[PDB]
Design a protein around this motif. Structure first.
Motif, PDB file in Angstrom:
ATOM      1  N   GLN A   1      72.859  80.009 -27.770  1.00 27.28           N
ATOM      2  CA  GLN A   1      72.671  78.799 -28.009  1.00 27.28           C
ATOM      3  C   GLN A   1      71.261  78.485 -28.439  1.00 27.28           C
ATOM      4  N   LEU A   2      70.269  79.364 -28.330  1.00 23.02           N
ATOM      5  CA  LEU A   2      68.946  79.548 -28.753  1.00 23.02           C
ATOM      6  C   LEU A   2      68.970  80.004 -30.190  1.00 23.02           C
ATOM      7  N   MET A   3      69.870  81.026 -30.516  1.00 20.60           N
ATOM      8  CA  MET A   3      69.833  81.585 -31.952  1.00 20.60           C
ATOM      9  C   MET A   3      70.608  80.594 -33.109  1.00 20.60           C
ATOM     10  N   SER A   4      71.584  80.132 -32.658  1.00 19.30           N
ATOM     11  CA  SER A   4      72.449  79.246 -33.649  1.00 19.30           C
ATOM     12  C   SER A   4      71.671  78.366 -34.341  1.00 19.30           C
ATOM     13  N   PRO A   5      70.554  77.609 -33.921  1.00 16.03           N
ATOM     14  CA  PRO A   5      69.829  76.731 -34.710  1.00 16.03           C
ATOM     15  C   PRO A   5      68.891  77.445 -35.660  1.00 16.03           C
ATOM     16  N   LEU A   6      68.674  78.649 -35.214  1.00 14.82           N
ATOM     17  CA  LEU A   6      67.392  79.660 -35.967  1.00 14.82           C
ATOM     18  C   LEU A   6      68.241  80.310 -37.222  1.00 14.82           C
ATOM     19  N   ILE A   7      69.581  80.550 -36.883  1.00 12.70           N
ATOM     20  CA  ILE A   7      70.404  81.231 -38.155  1.00 12.70           C
ATOM     21  C   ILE A   7      70.602  80.272 -39.024  1.00 12.70           C
ATOM     22  N   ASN A   8      70.848  78.938 -38.895  1.00  8.92           N
ATOM     23  CA  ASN A   8      70.901  77.675 -39.627  1.00  8.92           C
ATOM     24  C   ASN A   8      69.406  77.643 -40.525  1.00  8.92           C
ATOM     25  N   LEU A   9      68.606  77.631 -39.782  1.00 11.92           N
ATOM     26  CA  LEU A   9      67.221  77.510 -40.645  1.00 11.92           C
ATOM     27  C   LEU A   9      67.161  78.860 -41.585  1.00 11.92           C
ATOM     28  N   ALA A  10      67.143  80.067 -41.132  1.00 11.66           N
ATOM     29  CA  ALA A  10      67.298  81.136 -42.145  1.00 11.66           C
ATOM     30  C   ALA A  10      68.080  80.912 -43.484  1.00 11.66           C
ATOM     31  N   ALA A  11      69.577  80.410 -43.044  1.00 15.54           N
ATOM     32  CA  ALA A  11      70.391  80.028 -44.199  1.00 15.54           C
ATOM     33  C   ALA A  11      69.572  79.046 -45.329  1.00 15.54           C
ATOM     34  N   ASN A  12      69.183  78.126 -44.742  1.00 22.14           N
ATOM     35  CA  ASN A  12      68.563  77.186 -45.687  1.00 22.14           C
ATOM     36  C   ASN A  12      67.297  77.716 -46.344  1.00 22.14           C
ATOM     37  N   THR A  13      66.314  78.412 -45.584  1.00 22.78           N
ATOM     38  CA  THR A  13      65.288  79.209 -45.976  1.00 22.78           C
ATOM     39  C   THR A  13      65.545  80.125 -47.235  1.00 22.78           C
ATOM     40  N   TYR A  14      66.459  80.879 -47.179  1.00 20.49           N
ATOM     41  CA  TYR A  14      66.767  82.030 -48.023  1.00 20.49           C
ATOM     42  C   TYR A  14      68.235  81.465 -49.106  1.00 20.49           C
ATOM     43  N   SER A  15      68.221  80.132 -49.170  1.00 20.10           N
ATOM     44  CA  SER A  15      69.494  79.820 -49.651  1.00 20.10           C
ATOM     45  C   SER A  15      69.917  80.361 -51.125  1.00 20.10           C
ATOM     46  N   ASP A  16      68.964  80.669 -51.918  1.00 22.24           N
ATOM     47  CA  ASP A  16      69.217  81.161 -53.226  1.00 22.24           C
ATOM     48  C   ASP A  16      69.134  82.746 -53.105  1.00 22.24           C
ATOM     49  N   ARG A  17      69.143  83.485 -52.091  1.00 19.99           N
ATOM     50  CA  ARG A  17      69.110  84.894 -52.272  1.00 19.99           C
ATOM     51  C   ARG A  17      69.947  85.420 -50.921  1.00 19.99           C
ATOM     52  N   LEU A  18      70.603  84.809 -49.920  1.00 18.09           N
ATOM     53  CA  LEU A  18      71.220  85.239 -48.978  1.00 18.09           C
ATOM     54  C   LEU A  18      72.478  84.409 -48.775  1.00 18.09           C
ATOM     55  N   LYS A  19      73.520  84.962 -48.322  1.00 17.69           N
ATOM     56  CA  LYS A  19      74.607  84.228 -47.766  1.00 17.69           C
ATOM     57  C   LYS A  19      74.902  84.402 -46.092  1.00 17.69           C
ATOM     58  N   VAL A  20      74.739  83.543 -45.438  1.00 22.85           N
ATOM     59  CA  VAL A  20      74.793  83.417 -44.173  1.00 22.85           C
ATOM     60  C   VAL A  20      76.259  83.347 -43.356  1.00 22.85           C
ATOM     61  N   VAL A  21      76.958  84.040 -42.573  1.00 22.47           N
ATOM     62  CA  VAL A  21      78.194  83.606 -42.027  1.00 22.47           C
ATOM     63  C   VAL A  21      78.073  84.130 -40.300  1.00 22.47           C
ATOM     64  N   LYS A  22      78.970  83.278 -39.874  1.00 19.02           N
ATOM     65  CA  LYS A  22      79.161  83.799 -38.300  1.00 19.02           C
ATOM     66  C   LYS A  22      80.666  83.831 -37.797  1.00 19.02           C
ATOM     67  N   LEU A  23      80.872  84.570 -37.070  1.00 18.61           N
ATOM     68  CA  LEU A  23      82.121  84.937 -36.499  1.00 18.61           C
ATOM     69  C   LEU A  23      81.820  84.710 -34.720  1.00 18.61           C
ATOM     70  N   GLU A  24      82.874  84.174 -34.196  1.00 12.61           N
ATOM     71  CA  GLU A  24      82.940  84.090 -32.694  1.00 12.61           C
ATOM     72  C   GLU A  24      83.740  85.518 -32.245  1.00 12.61           C
ATOM     73  N   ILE A  25      83.269  86.338 -31.305  1.00 11.73           N
ATOM     74  CA  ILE A  25      84.064  87.758 -31.185  1.00 11.73           C
ATOM     75  C   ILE A  25      85.376  87.475 -30.602  1.00 11.73           C
ATOM     76  N   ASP A  26      85.740  86.337 -29.772  1.00 16.97           N
ATOM     77  CA  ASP A  26      86.829  86.487 -29.115  1.00 16.97           C
ATOM     78  C   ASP A  26      88.215  86.563 -29.930  1.00 16.97           C
ATOM     79  N   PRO A  27      88.337  85.703 -30.990  1.00 16.20           N
ATOM     80  CA  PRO A  27      89.363  85.382 -31.965  1.00 16.20           C
ATOM     81  C   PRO A  27      89.399  86.487 -33.031  1.00 16.20           C
ATOM     82  N   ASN A  28      88.388  87.564 -33.225  1.00 17.76           N
ATOM     83  CA  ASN A  28      88.027  88.463 -34.317  1.00 17.76           C
ATOM     84  C   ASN A  28      87.770  89.838 -34.062  1.00 17.76           C
TER      85      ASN A  28
END
Length: 108
Positions: free
Chosen positions: A36-63
């Motif tokens: 829960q503490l990381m989710s917001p931060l990951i979103n921040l990184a995505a916005n910050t490096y929007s032009d040089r990085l792709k950010v994705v997330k996966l829930e472990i249970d269904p994958n």
């Protein structure tokens, strides 16, 4: 890539392995408190490096396939990859500063 896209095993190959840019893959679970503490931060990184990085997330249970592929044996977890190459990885909650440096080191 202004934000984070949630993917599944079925979309992993086209969204990550075949992406044109490096991809930050974030693993989390609904039963994971520190996640829960990381989710917001990951979103921040995505916005910050929007032009040089792709950010994705996966829930472990269904994958199960992607989880096994990256030896994700605990959450939260990060894998920075480029095609089949794993550039770096980390386990546990990290600070905004540590995250930004984790990325800067590899994006430059």
């Amino acid at each position: 890539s202004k934000g984070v896209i949630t993917i599944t095993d079925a979309e992993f190959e086209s969204e990550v392995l075949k992406a044109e840019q490096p991809v930050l893959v974030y693993f989390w679970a609904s039963w994971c408190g520190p996640c829960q503490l990381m989710s917001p931060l990951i979103n921040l990184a995505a916005n910050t490096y929007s032009d040089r990085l792709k950010v994705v997330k996966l829930e472990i249970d269904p994958n199960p396939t992607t989880v096994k592929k990256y030896k994700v044996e605990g959450v939260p977890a990060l894998r920075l990859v480029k095609g089949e190459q794993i550039l770096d990885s980390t386990e546990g909650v990290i600070s905004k500063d540590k995250l930004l440096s984790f990325l800067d080191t590899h994006l430059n």
